[PDB]
Design a protein around this nucleic acid. Structure first.
Ligand SMILES: Nc1ncnc2c1ncn2[C@@H]1O[C@H](COP(=O)(O)OP(=O)(O)O)[C@@H](O)[C@H]1O
Ligand SMILES: Nc1ncnc2c1ncn2[C@@H]1O[C@H](COP(=O)(O)OP(=O)(O)O)[C@@H](O)[C@H]1O
Ligand SMILES: [Mg+2]
Ligand SMILES: [Mg+2]
Lengths: 759, 749
DNA sequence: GCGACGCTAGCGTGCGGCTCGTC
DNA sequence: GGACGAGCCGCCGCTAGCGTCG
């Protein structure tokens, strides 16, 4: 069994290392960072792991019995080192010195304070402005999926019917760590797939049901709570759990977010989110992100969002003011959570004090209608307790302002006089001794001292007690000092105790406003998004969309592509119609399709869009078969299947070249059947194809569009006007030629084309 | 800004920072790493970068009149941060404190001029330079090996190819190229690699563009290896004297790098035991042979080891981990060999005698026993390049050093007697005798014994729990131990240098040895591979006949189905359902031809192959895919000859079905008239019936087992007659109605 | 016939703070 | 001869090695 360390030598394991091993084997998959004084240490193989991983120095901690390896890092840089460690895939186990040193039974009590897992981080410097989720998956009456953001207390979940739905929901939440129920873990089949589709870190957790609701949900939830409660090291700060239904929002499968690069790019470029987000606060960015993850289906609320955006679009003054003020607004939502968790540092409070000072200016600028909570009381006491620049930890320098604590002002009082003492003494001795240069100094090793140079050694009085000798200086001590020096240490010792109590007192003060802090967070976050979305409209020429059943876009453009090129706007009118798009490659087909979806996606999120006039219907979902079964034809077909099994007459469907990847024959066949299917379905379907046949089909709601090329001076020039009607001819041979194909080879091709044309 | 440091305050740069800025300003395009004690430091704006790029602790360097930000890395950790910093596109200038307030630029770390082993791969590491004149000038240099070669290319297309065969680490474009905005905009896009500036004043003879490129390399590399370079005679070569292997083919075939999803022809194939070997073999794969004479000679050598298993196994054992004599030689020649190097060298020399026993005089290895006896006589059984430079020469090697070390030791003894003797008079069995730079030697007494501390003493320094004293009869014996510790350094370094020099006088013998072993290593390894995976010796002749050939890389991962092929300047179409094996087949055919013309055995039973002049592929995936594919095709049509192996994989796709078949037919014809060995996997059954005299059909098929379709991987003769598109959409999950509708449509046509 | 305490010099990650030599 | 390198001690805690309770 386990209970031994890697150290060479016989005899027993020292009292400390003993305590080290005792905790180290309770968290087998965590790198244990042992708190020994002002350093975090690791011994044995664990010490080696560290040294190399962090380039630290490898040393040893020798004892009578044996000698083991040692590696440590100064607490000062804990987080600094933590971050690096986490990014490599380690779970950290922080074992701290619980009870103080001065009052310990020899060996100071040490226990694991917190656990640092990628999906349960609370450390602000270790978190992105974005939401950080822990996700739990379980079975038992369908698929159970739950998320928890330990830093904000967001706690939500649902139950999905298919393995497909689960993966979609999971992929739109971008979980940073996943807990898999017993069943799924065992099943090597599933695990492979999951591990392959979501390269996220996996972790073990007990899936004992918790609360009420579908068995599956209760298990995932419990798993979350079980795990998080363990890494936090105490009760968690949870928000009302949301058992939500993804059927209430617009469907955005994984293939759509990916193909549309809503959150992640295909080529280290921009994404819809990067381009759209100009929020100033972190909760703001989170809100916006949340909105994109689940676009609304309901006209009313979307119109509500659009009014508030339009508001700031008009009030440029106001809009720039609110944004000018939010630049300084801290993550209240997270701060409120750190407080409730009794983790708030003086850094946090200083931050809180600044944010709260912005409130009243926002109140004035927008009016008392914003609903902002009145924290003026809290804000003030903070300004009256904290230094203009709050230090990191309490025991060190001044944290509380002078004049705030009667008990503490008397302490700095006594300390000031006490220090002055030694100053007075200097002059008294420089006289009695007649030694002009006589200094009075201090230092950790010997305490307060009287210093005298060599030229005056024979001039030093009997009374002086030697304490330290240097190259050409000697240091003495009088009895008076010895006393007054301990009066100073007592003070200093009392000054810390109190300064920290006052801090803790004031903190708890802010902790009773946590909920108020939370609601200001929400209000100010919406404020942030509304102004940001407006900022984006103004800067990039977007307009307010109008909803209805007919889609009529005028001068629409791709929101991301136009960011890096003179983009030629285009129009579109659809209505449960089947719109085929033909024309030469490099002309614009694929970009046109993508442009259409993004516009729809932006509108149904409440943002203005990249067009001159945009009348949009409320799509129940955006489905795509763009870009991307051993074969390609099979992979593309599997997608058409999915798209075909969920599209409704209220779905925006975008097909790009469906039918490619096989025989010309099965090509047209499949494409035709498919195009007929989506036609019957009655969804809004944009199909970019190379089978001119599909354009001639005998369908009642079939419309035709095309892009074109003009064979000019230097070959072929592709314009991007998406003109009405079908494409006339294909430009393959022409392109081949342009590509450099030997002139005879091309001419032979033209002859073959014209021969087959002759029937 | 020269003399300017990013900081706050008026007053001049203190003495130190003044020095720093003086060097910093000498190597502008580089990040200057300044030595300060046990760290490499950066100041001002540079410190901010270093801190940024490595995420370090920004702090400040303060003097009365100026404070500037600083950040640094431990002198030790150096080579580890250098790597991160290099990979990030950083060029490094190292400034070391000349072994005892004085600093200078020792090295210049650069992607394509690296000399430090821990920063180099087993493979060659080139610095390339491209210039212009009548045709392109390409020249490669590998400062760690001395390899110096070049050629003159006619087409920018051929340029890129040679540039890619070599995978340079750093490129130097002449000024005409750097100013040509279109080229540079293209070069970066197609060749993501660090581009450096460098003078191009011609050097030597031959074409103007070559001499110029050659000069850039020489001039630039010397700046790096601060002085004369160690280089073997410049080798001018002709890409036309070897089998052509263009970037398209190298990538398509994954000779050196995978399309992601590991395993290259090279990894599978590579089984060498030394770096020179790995380099040799890579060199061969890089330029396959045309001439049967040499090829048959290589195959002869390979067979030698396939027969002599005892020999093969005995040689691969001895070579295990054997050092890189070629690089070692170069470091010695450059005057950069570390004591650790000399130690590695002696180990290598010790093994050399054994290899000669096994092989024999035939081989021609040099007898270096004398150098090996020397190295065994002077070096400790573990030289330490890092540990000072002391504890380097062993006892009894050099009398002078020996006498000094002995005297020193006595001193230490004295300061061990003063200890035993004193506490044996003061009753303080605690009393210590330690030393410190500040005052030299001393006596150390703990707090308790101050009452038992005599007056013959003289305190010099007091500590928390103890105080250190002095004595009269102790100064001399200090000013002596030191005068020696110094001399021991002075002398030991002399001997080390003397010894290092003897090793350096055997540079050629080392290079000659390295080279021979490299061949032996390669032949013996190509033998090992043939014996393990069952490769056969190929035969050369105007007809291609392969009996049961397998894709060499693919098979190491699954049960492979071998196949046959009989070509002869014919157009061989391959139809059949996707997922059956068309693309793999073309590729195995190509890899086999490659292994053969490299002098390796091949993955088959019988392989009679023609000596192709080049293998041109068109396989796999602002510009439409179609246009890119056509450009590749145009390349082949302008290159392929009747002795070329051309592999067309579904050419024609990416456009209309008409233009598709039309283009595809015109190409198939052009290659037919060309008379090259063409394997054309297509979906256009039209090609299958062109009826050309040298056209031929082959296809793969699929059965309808259990649920849907199972693809057998057998390449049968003649064309396929079906397409399983609809059959596949069915398995894909397409709604039965849509599937049925498709079938109705299919037939209806 | 030896378990149990007490006193206390000393080491050691990374790194302020203190000292000292040179001018 | 006030200021600038250049380098050693010790932090906070635990231990081992010594005396000693009796
Ligand atoms: N409306 C447009 N305005 C400006 N550039 C466009 C437009 N549509 C396409 N492009 C350009 O054409 C290139 C892409 O071809 P694309 O139109 O997507 O493919 P195709 O027409 O082959 O489906 C894009 O990278 C972009 O630079
Ligand atoms: N000779 C073979 N033996 C075993 N598997 C093979 C063989 N040739 C091909 N395959 C299989 O086919 C896959 C590749 O199909 P591929 O060669 O690309 O066929 P195609 O181009 O007709 O789609 C391989 O990864 C493997 O699964
Ligand atoms: Mg396209
Ligand atoms: Mg294929």
């Amino acid at each position: 069994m386990e209970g031994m360390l890697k150290g060479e030598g016989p005899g027993p394991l020292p009292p400390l290392l003993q305590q080290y091993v005792e905790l180290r084997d309770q968290y087998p998959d965590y790198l244990l960072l042992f708190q020994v004084g002002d350093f975090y240490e690791c011994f044995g193989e664990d010490a080696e792991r560290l040294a190399r991983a962090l380039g630290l120095v490898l040393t040893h901690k020798t004892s009578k019995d044996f000698t083991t390896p040692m590696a440590g890092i100064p607490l000062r840089a804990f987080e600094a080192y933590a971050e690096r460690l986490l990014k490599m895939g380690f779970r950290l186990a922080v074992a701290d010195q619980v009870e103080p040193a001065e009052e310990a039974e020899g060996l100071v009590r040490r226990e694991v304070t917190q656990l640092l897992t990628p999906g349960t981080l609370l450390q602000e410097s270790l978190l992105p402005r974005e939401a950080n989720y822990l996700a739990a998956i379980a079975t038992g009456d369908g698929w159970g999926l739950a998320f928890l953001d330990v830093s904000t207390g967001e706690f939500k979940g649902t139950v999905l019917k298919s393995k497909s739905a689960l993966y979609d929901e999971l992929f739109r939440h971008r979980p940073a760590e996943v807990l898999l129920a017993p069943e799924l873990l065992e099943n090597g089949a599933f695990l492979d797939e999951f591990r392959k589709r979501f390269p996220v870190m996996l972790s073990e957790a007990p899936f004992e049901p918790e609360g009420e609701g579908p068995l599956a949900l209760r298990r995932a939830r419990g798993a979350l709570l079980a795990y998080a409660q363990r890494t936090q090291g105490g009760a968690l700060s949870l928000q009302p759990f949301r058992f939500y239904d993804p059927g209430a929002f617009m469907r955005l499968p994984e293939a759509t977010l990916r193909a549309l690069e809503v959150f992640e790019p295909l080529r280290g470029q921009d994404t819809l989110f990067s381009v759209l987000d100009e929020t100033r606060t972190a909760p703001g960015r989170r809100l916006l992100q949340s909105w994109l993850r689940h676009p609304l289906l309901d006209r009313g609320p979307l119109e509500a969002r659009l009014d508030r955006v339009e508001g700031f679009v008009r009030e440029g003054a106001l809009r720039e003011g609110v944004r000018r003020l939010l630049y300084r607004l801290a993550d209240l939502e997270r701060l409120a959570t750190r407080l409730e968790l009794g983790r708030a540092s003086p850094k946090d409070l200083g931050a809180l004090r600044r944010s709260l000072q912005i409130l009243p200016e926002l109140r004035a600028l927008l009016g008392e209608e914003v609903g902002l909570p009145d924290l003026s009381p809290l804000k003030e006491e903070l300004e009256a307790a904290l230094v203009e620049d709050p230090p990191l930890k309490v025991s060190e320098g001044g944290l509380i302002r002078e004049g705030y604590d009667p008990d503490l002002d008397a302490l700095r009082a006594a300390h000031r006089e006490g220090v002055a003492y030694f100053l007075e003494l200097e002059e008294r001795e420089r006289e009695r001794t007649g030694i002009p240069t006589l200094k009075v100094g201090y230092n950790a090793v010997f305490g307060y001292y009287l210093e005298v140079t060599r030229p005056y050694y024979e001039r030093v009085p009997k009374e002086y007690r030697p304490v330290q000798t240097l190259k050409d200086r000697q240091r003495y001590t009088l009895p008076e000092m010895k006393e007054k020096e301990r009066e100073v240490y007592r003070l200093e010792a009392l000054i810390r105790r109190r300064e920290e109590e006052v801090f803790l007192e004031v903190r708890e003060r802010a902790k009773r406003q946590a909920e108020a802090l939370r609601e200001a967070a929400r209000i100010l976050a919406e404020l942030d998004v509304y102004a940001a979305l407006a900022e984006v409209a103004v800067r990039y020429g977007y307009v307010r969309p109008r909803f209805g059943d007919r889609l009529q876009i005028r001068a629409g453009r791709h929101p991301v592509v136009e960011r890096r090129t003179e983009f030629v706007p285009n129009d579109l009118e659809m209505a449960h119609e089947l719109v085929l798009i033909t024309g030469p490659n490099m002309a614009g087909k694929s970009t046109f399709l993508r442009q259409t979806a993004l516009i729809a996606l932006l509108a149904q999120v409440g943002s203005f869009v990249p067009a001159e006039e945009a009348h949009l219907p409320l799509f129940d979902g955006i489905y795509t078969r763009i870009g991307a079964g051993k074969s390609t034809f099979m992979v593309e077909m599997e997608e058409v299947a999915l798209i075909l099994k969920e599209a409704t007459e209220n779905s925006l469907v975008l097909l790009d070249e469906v039918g490619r990847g096989t025989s010309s024959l099965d090509g047209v066949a499949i494409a035709t059947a498919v195009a007929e299917a989506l036609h019957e379905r009655r969804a809004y379907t944009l199909f970019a194809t190379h089978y001119f046949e599909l354009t001639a089909l005998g369908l009642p709601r079939l419309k035709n569009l095309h892009v074109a090329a003009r064979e000019e001076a230097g070959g072929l020039v592709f314009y991007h006007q998406v003109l009405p009607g079908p494409a006339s001819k294909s430009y393959g041979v022409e392109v081949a030629a342009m590509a450099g194909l030997p002139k005879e080879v091309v001419a032979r091709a033209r002859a073959l084309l014209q021969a087959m044309a002759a029937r």
